[PDB]
Amino acid sequence: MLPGTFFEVLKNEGVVAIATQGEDGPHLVNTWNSYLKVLDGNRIVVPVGGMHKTEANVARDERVLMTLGSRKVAGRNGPGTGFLIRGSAAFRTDGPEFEAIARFKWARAALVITVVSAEQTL
Amino acid sequence: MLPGTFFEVLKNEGVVAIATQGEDGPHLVNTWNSYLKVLDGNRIVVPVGGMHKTEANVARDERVLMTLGSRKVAGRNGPGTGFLIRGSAAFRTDGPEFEAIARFKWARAALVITVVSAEQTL
Ligand SMILES: Cc1cc2nc3c(=O)[nH]c(=O)nc-3n(C[C@H](O)[C@H](O)[C@H](O)COP(=O)(O)O)c2cc1C
Ligand SMILES: Cc1cc2nc3c(=O)[nH]c(=O)nc-3n(C[C@H](O)[C@H](O)[C@H](O)COP(=O)(O)O)c2cc1C
């Protein structure tokens, strides 16, 4: 379901945000557009170095939200666009989703988000 | 309390993410690094065109989280850095906080974030 414009965003660098639900309120962490790996079957993989509070949150509520964008891709009414992605998350420490990001030697795990919806919000 | 490195990030374009607490989970919306105005008092001002769900969430729980960064500013271990900002939010529709973003013709309000902590997370 990810549209072509999402793939054009990923050709450009930028800050990705990942929100999870904590018992206390939301939590928000980041990665880089250039670190995301998209796999077949609507999966986006993030290399995990820290994300310890995020991991604790996902263990109790697997729903996540993610945003990303780029001023270098056109939106509906001028330069710049981005996406709100909703999905479910899991952490993996082995298997092909882990091997997709194992080139980052600092990664202790892979955060795998299975996308359920993608909205271009600009 | 906002440090010099944060102002260096703001000289570069990027996607800002703002998380609020909803009824049924977090919500996450964006702005651009180039749209933020910073006022005396640890106050960050965001021009509001939509953010209707965000505004409903803030009316119930004023706490927000914000992230932003840039690959063009050095972090602690290599190129690229960014920040986790925690603060409290209010929407303003008159006064100096609104005037700071009034040049945006589509703005309906100013989202004013009063910063309580700022962490450089890379
Ligand atoms: C621009 C940016 C990119 C980041 N990329 C990563 C990343 O790819 N993986 C990672 O684990 N943390 C990354 N971080 C740090 C995370 O945002 C987070 O601060 C850290 O993993 C701790 O997560 P936690 O608060 O869930 O314990 C990045 C931070 C910034 C500002
Ligand atoms: C990169 C980017 C920049 C955006 N900047 C703004 C902005 O400055 N102000 C705004 O109202 N919405 C902006 N949006 C749209 C918001 O993220 C959000 O989708 C919209 O305001 C609706 O908010 P709500 O879901 O809280 O109702 C931006 C979207 C993207 C992808």
Curated annotation (Swiss-Prot), chains A, B:
UniProt keyword S-adenosyl-L-methionine present: no
InterPro entries: Pyridox_Oxase_N (IPR011576), Split_barrel_FMN-bd (IPR012349)
Record key words, sorted: Cytoplasm, Electron transport, Flavoprotein, FMN, Transport
Co-factor(s): FMN
Any Pfam family: PNPOx_N
Keyword Metal-binding: no
Annotated compartments: Cytoplasm
Highest taxon in the source lineage: Bacteria
GO cellular component labels: cytoplasm
Function summary: Functions as a redox protein with a potential of -325 mV.
Subunit structure, interactors included: Monomer and homodimer.
Protein name (Swiss-Prot/TrEMBL): FMN-binding protein
Organism of provenance: Nitratidesulfovibrio vulgaris (strain DSM 19637 / Miyazaki F) (Desulfovibrio vulgaris)
